[PDB]
Amino acid sequence: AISIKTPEDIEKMRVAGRLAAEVLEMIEPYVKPGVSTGELDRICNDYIVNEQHAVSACLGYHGYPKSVCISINEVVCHGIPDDAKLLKDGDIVNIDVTVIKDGFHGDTSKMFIVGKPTIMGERLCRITQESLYLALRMVKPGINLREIGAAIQKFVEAEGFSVVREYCGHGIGRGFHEEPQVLHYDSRETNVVLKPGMTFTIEPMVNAGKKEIRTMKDGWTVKTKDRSLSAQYEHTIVVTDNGCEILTLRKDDTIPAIISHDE
Ligand SMILES: O=C(O)c1ccc(-c2ccc([N+](=O)[O-])cc2Cl)o1
Ligand SMILES: [Mn+2]
Ligand SMILES: [Mn+2]
Ligand code: NA
């Protein structure tokens, strides 16, 4: 059931969302050529635990081995931090974070371009973040989630990219994943009219090539079937009386934290 968060819970969600975003702001200086994804994960975990006094919702979830998910280039999601995996110039890397604090979850991720960027890499990431932004600008009471999914897809496909169908955004609160499902493409099964108090994520996964994906034998790593690049950005938001409030905004975001549609 889609729950409406109380003002009190929403504040707890702001706290958790801020922490999740700060993990990403903290890790920035470390995302450099030569660094291992394994070390990046250890830095985030130490920060979450020793500094934020929070916990990673990913650790142990369905047996997931690390504190954050780190996906590089062709890897679509659930990449596993590994000490032998080194970042290099041109890489596009997603670091996905979910922390629990005072019982509530903050879920967010962003792409990082390592060293000297590649134009195609920058473009994929830019378009992906823009697809998230256009969706955020649509969130307000009364709108149907299907309209947002359709808009994300239209935009992405127009750029010659594709949207991954296997994964979606989700309601969030005392639980990591709660109703409703937030598809990033058009579907007849989607009929969710938004209302104030609802909290959920928007996190499109976009492939530069075809939408098809495959999972590696490690049981976790998901890559694009055609080995094209894939990018993802995610934000946790709360629907307000006249729009929405992004709970995981970072200083590098270029969209307002509070979006209002009132005159
Ligand atoms: O941002 C998210 O929702 C997210 C990051 C990684 C996951 C996740 C989802 C489902 C499973 N699973 O084993 O079904 C594992 C993870 Cl780490 O979800
Ligand atoms: Mn996430
Ligand atoms: Mn999520
Ligand atoms: Na990727």
Contact 131, 201 (CB under 8 A): no
The residues spanned by each domain of the chain are 1-263
Resolution (A): 1.7
Ligand nearest the Cα of residue 98 is: 2
Q: How buried is 165 (Cβ within 10 angstroms: 0-12 exposed, 13-18 middle, 19+ buried)? A: middle
- The residue to mutate among 64, 77, 178, 222, having the most atoms of ligand 1 within 8 angstroms of its beta carbon, is 64
Pocket of ligand 1 (CB under 6 A): 58, 61-62, 64, 69, 78, 96, 98, 107, 170, 203, 234
CB-based contacts of 234, cutoff 8 Å, min separation 6: 96, 107, 108, 109, 110, 132, 169, 201, 202, 203, 248
The length of the chain, given as a count of residues: 263
Ligand nearest the Cα of residue 236 is: 3
Solved with: X-ray
Residue corresponding to tokens 């049981």: 219
Contact 109, 63 (CB under 8 A): no
- 242 C-alpha to center of ligand 1: Å? 31
Burial 227-260 (b: 16+ CB within 10 A, else e): ebbbbbbbbbbbbbeebbbbbbbbeebeeeeebe
Six-digit token string for 173:
């609160």
User: What CATH architecture applies to the domain 1-263?
Assistant: Alpha-Beta Complex (3.90)
The rounded distance, in Å, linking the Cα atoms of 94 and 125 is 10
- 263 C-alpha to center of ligand 3: Å? 32
Q: Which residues are part of a known binding site? A: 78, 96, 98, 107, 170, 177, 203, 234
